[PDB]
Enzyme design. Structure first.
Site, PDB file in Angstrom:
ATOM      1  N   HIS A 265      45.567  43.777  32.293  1.00 35.72           N
ATOM      2  CA  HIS A 265      45.051  43.865  33.631  1.00 35.72           C
ATOM      3  C   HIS A 265      45.554  42.757  34.546  1.00 35.72           C
ATOM      4  CE1 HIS A 265      41.802  46.749  32.530  1.00 35.72           C
ATOM      5  NE2 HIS A 265      41.859  46.124  31.369  1.00 35.72           N
TER       6      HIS A 265
ATOM      7  N   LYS B   2      36.265  42.241  48.034  1.00 40.17           N
ATOM      8  CA  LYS B   2      36.820  41.994  46.703  1.00 40.17           C
ATOM      9  C   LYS B   2      36.604  40.498  46.412  1.00 40.17           C
ATOM     10  CE  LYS B   2      40.678  43.488  48.431  1.00 40.17           C
ATOM     11  NZ  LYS B   2      41.223  44.481  47.458  1.00 40.17           N
ATOM     12  N   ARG B   3      36.780  40.091  45.159  1.00 38.65           N
ATOM     13  CA  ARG B   3      36.679  38.662  44.818  1.00 38.65           C
ATOM     14  C   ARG B   3      37.677  37.845  45.657  1.00 38.65           C
ATOM     15  NH1 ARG B   3      33.378  37.181  40.051  1.00 38.65           N
ATOM     16  NH2 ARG B   3      34.488  35.199  40.309  1.00 38.65           N
TER      17      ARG B   3
ATOM     18  N   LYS C 172      45.053  37.775  46.793  1.00 40.25           N
ATOM     19  CA  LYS C 172      44.481  38.894  47.555  1.00 40.25           C
ATOM     20  C   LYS C 172      44.613  38.660  49.079  1.00 40.25           C
ATOM     21  CE  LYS C 172      41.155  40.102  43.815  1.00 40.25           C
ATOM     22  NZ  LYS C 172      41.386  41.585  43.692  1.00 40.25           N
TER      23      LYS C 172
ATOM     24  N   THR D  10      41.002  48.894  42.489  1.00 38.29           N
ATOM     25  CA  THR D  10      40.143  50.071  42.426  1.00 38.29           C
ATOM     26  C   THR D  10      39.309  50.257  43.677  1.00 38.29           C
ATOM     27  OG1 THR D  10      38.489  48.807  41.151  1.00 38.29           O
ATOM     28  CG2 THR D  10      39.984  50.258  39.973  1.00 38.29           C
TER      29      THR D  10
ATOM     30  N   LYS E  29      38.234  53.689  46.181  1.00 40.72           N
ATOM     31  CA  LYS E  29      36.893  53.940  46.697  1.00 40.72           C
ATOM     32  C   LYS E  29      36.948  54.206  48.191  1.00 40.72           C
ATOM     33  CE  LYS E  29      35.174  50.602  43.296  1.00 40.72           C
ATOM     34  NZ  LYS E  29      34.604  49.280  43.145  1.00 40.72           N
TER      35      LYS E  29
HETATM   36  C1  LIG Z   1      39.473  33.375  32.905  1.00 44.02           C
HETATM   37  C2  LIG Z   1      40.575  34.387  32.580  1.00 44.02           C
HETATM   38  C3  LIG Z   1      40.535  34.703  31.078  1.00 44.02           C
HETATM   39  C4  LIG Z   1      40.467  35.569  33.413  1.00 44.02           C
HETATM   40  C5  LIG Z   1      41.403  35.737  34.450  1.00 44.02           C
HETATM   41  C6  LIG Z   1      41.383  36.849  35.292  1.00 44.02           C
HETATM   42  C7  LIG Z   1      40.405  37.828  35.115  1.00 44.02           C
HETATM   43  C8  LIG Z   1      40.398  38.935  35.999  1.00 44.02           C
HETATM   44  C9  LIG Z   1      41.220  40.155  35.517  1.00 44.02           C
HETATM   45  C10 LIG Z   1      41.021  40.392  34.038  1.00 44.02           C
HETATM   46  C11 LIG Z   1      40.836  41.428  36.327  1.00 44.02           C
HETATM   47  O1  LIG Z   1      39.699  41.673  36.728  1.00 44.02           O
HETATM   48  N1  LIG Z   1      41.872  42.209  36.595  1.00 44.02           N
HETATM   49  C12 LIG Z   1      41.750  43.404  37.417  1.00 44.02           C
HETATM   50  O2  LIG Z   1      41.624  44.571  36.596  1.00 44.02           O
HETATM   51  C13 LIG Z   1      41.380  45.714  37.428  1.00 44.02           C
HETATM   52  C14 LIG Z   1      41.086  46.890  36.512  1.00 44.02           C
HETATM   53  O3  LIG Z   1      42.332  47.228  35.886  1.00 44.02           O
HETATM   54  C15 LIG Z   1      42.604  45.977  38.377  1.00 44.02           C
HETATM   55  O4  LIG Z   1      42.346  47.092  39.255  1.00 44.02           O
HETATM   56  C16 LIG Z   1      42.946  44.741  39.226  1.00 44.02           C
HETATM   57  O5  LIG Z   1      44.205  44.934  39.906  1.00 44.02           O
HETATM   58  C17 LIG Z   1      43.038  43.496  38.290  1.00 44.02           C
HETATM   59  O6  LIG Z   1      43.216  42.277  39.049  1.00 44.02           O
HETATM   60  C18 LIG Z   1      39.440  37.679  34.090  1.00 44.02           C
HETATM   61  C19 LIG Z   1      39.481  36.561  33.241  1.00 44.02           C
END
Ligand SMILES: CC(C)c1ccc(C[C@@H](C)C(=O)N[C@@H]2O[C@H](CO)[C@@H](O)[C@H](O)[C@H]2O)cc1
Ligand SMILES: CC(C)c1ccc(C[C@@H](C)C(=O)N[C@@H]2O[C@H](CO)[C@@H](O)[C@H](O)[C@H]2O)cc1
Lengths: 807, 807
Positions: free
Chosen positions: B348, B539-540, B545, B647, B651
């Site tokens: 991801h 979004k976050r 972003k 995503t 939406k």
């Molecule tokens: C702390 C580290 C382990 C960590 C880094 C980044 C994230 C966020 C990642 C995993 C995330 O949320 N990715 C998102 O996944 C979505 C579902 O596939 C995508 O739509 C989106 O583009 C992607 O950023 C979580 C943990």
């Protein structure tokens, strides 16, 4: 099957069955193909609980409409035991549920054994609170029990190599179906901070806040459709790096985590003081809210009584003052008058190491405003003393709430006497001791404050529930009214020469002994002779309760058998059980000694099945309900002057055991009710103990003049009972010989002789049973219904009532 | 009232009413005179839950009989949101409950607002797991979601003086009616200890034990009577001075206490690693038990699929090996074959700081046996590399699972590729990037492993539930089948010239905007013009972003208004919302910047109601359900190559907003489905970003050649937006000018120009709405039903099914 257990109506049985199946499916989310016995237990619990809530809601509705005076019973301990069977008995559902479950292919007694004890107490004080809630509901009083919902109750006791091991009692693990969380009634409690003075009085500021969340448990009266509430507080952190701040919420929540298991020695631990303040602060806010939702606090004492169960909630006194003075702005004198008329205090011991004396520095830090109020209370109190006894400077220092010395302390008992309109002891001789020794100064100042209220036990749990056989044969002769009017048992005196009754009493006892003998084998894999006399001592392990004196008797029997193996002796199973406080080294040694004696005695071929010594592991309310109906002999052998009352004593008397004991606590009133000739009394009286103290107790004297005693001490010292560690019991020998506050040797001769008279009587079944009938018949005074009626009339100013509420 | 919400049968409405009253009385222990709206919410929740359990029990029964291949979806996050409305929609109960509650005098929508979000996730990855569970149930797959029942979910965000403040999300405070504790299925998990070697293989010994207790939550499919399970594990201490030992139980239980809120930067924290192992170890034991209760593990891959949601549960690979080799005694090679055929891994993200690389010393201490297995895996893997690419020593070090350096680390992504039969990215361009850059070596070794599965969203939550108006007017024209077959929305292309439809689309949107405009005023007391274009970025908060690029556009509009106040501009409400990771300083500054711009812009009399900038506080799933139906413009403006999919984009497309965005993630496929002419595409492509990196990105160049940009930077530096602290935003200016990994200035000109084309179209309502219809009509590919059907066929080897189970 038996009449006291109620009707099994066809309609009712059908309804219970369908609700049982409803809960199994919708509440537990199971079907009959994967359900465990635990699931079946829960489906029954929820079924029975549904019958409470209608009555719970309308009782509380009724109190809102009528607005009677409310009784608030404040305790740190409520030793409740199991709830399912009790609830069936009080609702008249026992036989219907039995039938209903039988028709579903289940055995109800098996399901009853799955329920965990609510072990939110240590012993007598906690169980007394539980008996009292039952009596208060049964007598139609508008009463609430308030305490703490501990996450871990009294520890489970395991015996490993003859030693007590503690393990956490995770009693909420599978859920508690009896409680209802009420998060909407959450209240703030303050700690630390500091006091600011202003034009507008004092303000307590910069405090840390812990939330108190209530959980309500229903308390059903006996067949009167009254259901009262027990409200227990849980500690929660307020919602205001990031990870650690979230994990540090546990520090606030630790307040309600664990029941303090120390019942012998006062320790000034901050966490304990926090528990005390927490229950007090949340309860008082709740009381006041309820009072306001019916300005004028003149009527507060006419609408509210607060009973303090020992000094543990003594901070209610300065907290009520704080609220009235700082927040509601009443003047000091008016607030004080309201406080005194509202509060009453019960004392449950005279041992000086048991009195709460908190260091000032702790109060200063935790509750700075309360310390101020306490100093002010103290000064106004001591001005009254000075005016009544001018020039008596020694009295002034003895009566002060503040004790001087290395560390300054507050005496919480003195605080309670000063701030209460009534002070009571818990048996007549205890209440006299209070007046003559440790509270003598206070009695001379305010004699009208001091009362007696002799303890009791509930005959619902302690006869009907645990001894259905006995309840039934009694009901055959005299009907069922005795269950809420235990004085009616006197009518049984007219059956003392009735041969059929004599036979039924003896049969009930024998069946109880066979059932218990079986339980031992099943859950704890060793065998006993059920024709022996069941000699039982069950209670917490303390030096004052003199489990050691019992031990000395057991070794005496053993040595007499070894000396004359082929002589006849009445066979005995000697059972001792109880928990020791984790830090109490001597109590832990006594447990080891008992198991050690068992190891020798139980494997001696020459003894055979004439003497057996069993240590009953994990004694608790549910085990009491099994062993007490099976007992022939009740050991109540505390040194005269030390057991404030006892309540186990009364349980045994009600269930057909004879009592061997000293003239201590309630034993005195028990022997008076039954007649001394129907009780096995021995030993020093209080007066003799005093004479011995004046002279000086020298244990060596007894060792020198009693050869049987000397032989026991030599066996102990030399390693007879501990072959692989010959000196294991040197602490015990040394205490008995040089440092025995409780004078075990001084009562040894008379105890052993009295035990011979017991044996003699047991050889004559008919006369043993006749003496038993005379005990059971006179046990009525020891109903907690009698006790509570006396608190209500003489302390709280409310009238009991036996009238039904509408179903 | 509306057709998609189901029938309101007289029988059904009557039944719901009586069950509602039953729960209010027996479950909540309340009556209508003291019940709060929270109580009414709970009585409805329990009423709706009762309709699940019948279907839950028979679904699970059905899977036991038929024994299909089971899909286990392992995630550390499940971002579920509220459950009540979703459950009504999937059971066809929405209108009946509405009627039933209306007849009781209650407004159901009001009660819906009381439910807490289950916020057990951070953002896209967690919400994807939640959409997927819904699709899996709707498609009749035997699927289980496994994760952790965090006590505290994602923090609640408060804005204080323009700054984010975090506060704990105590979501379980009032209870959770959807979950069922299953303490009878508690399982042990081991940590620490050491490895002993023997004749009979390795043994992991002297371990600390934590218990994993499961809580099951039902997952209903859409009108097919399938109810799957989400099983979330809670951490409990085993039951073996005394006080402190009881309080130290909190240390074990901290494992499941709190969701880790860091979604940008990998940190090697022990507590996080414990969470990862905990969910993995308990889940695998549960999987194996279920498999055995139907020796021969050859059929394990035919009965079990495990999907790894990112690397967070990557320890499933060595744990499955540990169990198969150490406990079941399979030989290594056979165990490895089973593992690879069982496991699949979804990636991801490509940002290198996001990849998990655990220090060896942590694994060594916590999971010594797992480190051994990982070294062995690595050695056998690198032997295969050496044999396929002889002499390529550089490849060997690049592909190793072990990274050397100051500290040695395990690369968890390399572990996942090695131990999985399939690796997928989450949008076509992302999956191509995986093959061409960061996993190129692995793709050359095993090209068959690599797949694409473009993400989707559930049209139940994300259209029917949150936008009933839109769902209804669609259903009028084309019926209801589209809800579980979203490709049918293509049929709407034939209504693009229909004047009545054009009018209905525009009315739904307008009503949604009025409703949202009202919500803002009510819960957050400030006013907006509902005739403006609603320009929304939610979004976050991350640099990639490019919320900052949006900020630059907003300041440009403001400066153009101030320059020519009396010129006409299309009015806009610009809304930006989202949470920042607690340790992410730059994200926290961006939030402050947004609020700071608002402070100036919203109080400028000259601007009036032509431009408003609102920061939407506490963005979460429940707020998404409100703001997304009210949006006209969707901002999807990440630097090309950085957003794996997105995503939120999908939406907005489904709910009638037009999209301005870069050719990144799923935006590419969205523009392809709708036609590029119906999408506002701007900016560098991936290829252009690369060319810029080769050359070197110099932000000064853009500052020198664009006067409008220079003016903004000068306003920032000089304190125009922070008068009382002129240098507040120096970190931002400095990053943009010298250290900008994401090239904000490089896309500024094209962004601003593209935003002018948006404004132009919005002036022509009919043509705006016509473009919207063309988006909605082509949004079908972005159903998670499509995504899951592709996982099922191409990865898991199971066939979806739309057939009803019997009610
Ligand atoms: C702390 C580290 C382990 C960590 C880094 C980044 C994230 C966020 C990642 C995993 C995330 O949320 N990715 C998102 O996944 C979505 C579902 O596939 C995508 O739509 C989106 O583009 C992607 O950023 C979580 C943990
Ligand atoms: C640690 C200290 C504060 C403490 C010491 C002793 C105890 C035990 C006391 C309070 C107790 O249980 N007393 C018992 O009360 C019973 C009910 O009145 C009596 O029957 C019994 O005689 C008495 O010992 C608790 C706490």
């Amino acid at each position: 099957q038996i009449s006291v257990r109620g009707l099994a109506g066809v309609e009712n049985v059908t309804e219970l069955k369908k609700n049982f199946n409803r809960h199994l499916h919708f509440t537990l989310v199971k079907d009959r193909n994967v359900a465990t016995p635990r699931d079946y237990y829960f489906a029954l619990a929820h079924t029975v609980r549904d019958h409470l809530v209608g009555r719970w809601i309308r009782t509380q509705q009724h109190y809102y409409e009528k607005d009677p005076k409310r009784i608030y019973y404040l305790s740190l301990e409520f030793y409740m035991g199991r709830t399912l069977q009790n609830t069936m008995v009080n609702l008249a559902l026992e036989n219907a549920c039995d039938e209903a479950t039988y028709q579903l292919g289940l055995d109800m007694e098996e399901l009853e054994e799955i329920e965990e004890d609510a072990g939110l107490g240590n012993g007598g004080l906690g169980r007394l609170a539980a008996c009292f809630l039952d009596s208060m509901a049964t007598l139609g009083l508008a009463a609430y029990g308030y305490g703490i919902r501990y996450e871990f109750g009294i520890f489970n006791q395991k015996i490993c190599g003859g030693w007590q091991m503690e393990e956490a009692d995770d009693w909420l693990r599978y859920g508690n179906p009896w409680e209802k969380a009420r998060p909407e009634f959450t209240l703030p409690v303050h700690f630390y901070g500091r006091v600011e003075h202003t034009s507008q009085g004092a303000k307590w500021v910069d405090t840390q806040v812990v939330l108190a969340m209530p959980y309500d448990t229903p308390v059903p009266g006996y067949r009167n459709n009254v259901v009262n509430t027990m409200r227990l507080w849980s500690a929660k952190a307020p919602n205001d790096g990031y990870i650690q701040a979230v994990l540090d919420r546990n520090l606030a929540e630790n307040i309600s985590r664990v029941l303090y298991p120390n019942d012998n020695f006062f320790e000034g631990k901050e966490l304990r003081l926090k528990q005390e303040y927490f229950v007090v602060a949340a309860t008082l806010q709740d009381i006041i809210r309820r009072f306001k939702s019916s300005t004028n606090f003149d009527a507060f004492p006419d609408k509210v009584a607060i009973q303090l169960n020992d000094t543990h909630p003594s901070l209610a006194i300065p907290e009520l003052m704080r609220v009235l003075v700082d927040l509601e702005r009443l003047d000091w004198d008016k607030a004080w008058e309201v406080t005194v008329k509202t509060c009453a205090y019960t004392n449950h011991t005279v041992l000086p190491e048991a009195l709460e004396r908190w260091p000032v520095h702790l109060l200063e830090t935790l509750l700075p405003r309360h310390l101020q109020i306490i100093y002010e209370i103290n000064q106004r109190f001591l001005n009254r003393v000075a005016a009544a006894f001018p020039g008596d400077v020694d009295r002034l220092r003895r009566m002060s709430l503040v004790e001087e010395g290395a560390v300054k302390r507050i005496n919480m008992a003195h605080l309670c006497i000063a701030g209460s309109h009534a002070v009571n002891g818990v048996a007549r001789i205890h209440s006299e001791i209070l007046k003559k020794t440790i509270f003598k100064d206070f009695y001379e100042l305010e004699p009208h404050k001091f009362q007696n209220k002799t303890n009791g036990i509930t005959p619902r749990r302690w006869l009907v529930l645990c001894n259905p056989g006995l309840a039934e044969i009694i009901a055959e002769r005299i009907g069922e009214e005795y269950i809420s009017d235990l004085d009616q048992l006197r009518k049984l005196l007219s059956y003392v020469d009735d041969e059929a009754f004599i036979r039924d009493v003896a049969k009930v006892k024998q069946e109880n002994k066979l059932k218990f003998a079986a339980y031992l084998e099943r859950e704890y894999k060793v065998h006993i002779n059920p024709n022996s006399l069941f000699d039982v001592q069950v209670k917490r392990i303390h030096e004052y309760k003199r489990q050691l004196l019992n031990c000395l008797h057991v070794i005496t029997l053993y040595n007499r058998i070894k000396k004359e193996p082929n002589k006849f002796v009445v066979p005995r199973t000697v059972m001792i059980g109880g928990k020791a406080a984790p830090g109490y080294h001597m109590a832990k040694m006594i447990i080891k000694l008992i198991t050690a004696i068992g190891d020798v005695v139980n494997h001696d071929p020459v003894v055979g099945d004439r003497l057996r010594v069993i240590f009953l592991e994990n004694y608790r309310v549910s085990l009491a309900e099994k062993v007490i109906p099976a007992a022939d002999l009740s050991e109540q052998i505390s040194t005269a002057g030390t057991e404030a009352s006892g309540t186990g004593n009364m349980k045994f008397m009600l269930n057909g055991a004879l009592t061997i004991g000293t003239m201590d606590g309630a034993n005195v009133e028990m022997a008076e009710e039954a007649g001394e000739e129907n009780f096995f009394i021995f030993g020093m009286r209080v007066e003799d103990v005093d004479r011995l103290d004046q002279r000086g107790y020298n244990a060596q004297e007894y060792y020198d003049r009693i050869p049987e005693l000397r032989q026991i001490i030599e066996q102990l010292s030399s390693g007879f009972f501990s072959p692989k560690q010959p000196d294991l019991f040197k602490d015990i020998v040394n205490m008995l010989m040089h440092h025995d506050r409780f004078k075990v040797f001084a009562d040894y001769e008379e105890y052993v002789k009295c035990q011979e008279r017991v044996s003699a009587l047991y050889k004559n079944p008919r006369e043993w049973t006749r003496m038993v009938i005379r005990n059971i018949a006179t046990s009525g005074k020891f109903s907690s219904d009698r006790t509570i009626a006396q608190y209500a009339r003489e302390i709280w100013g409310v009238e009991p009532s036996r009238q039904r509420l509408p179903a």
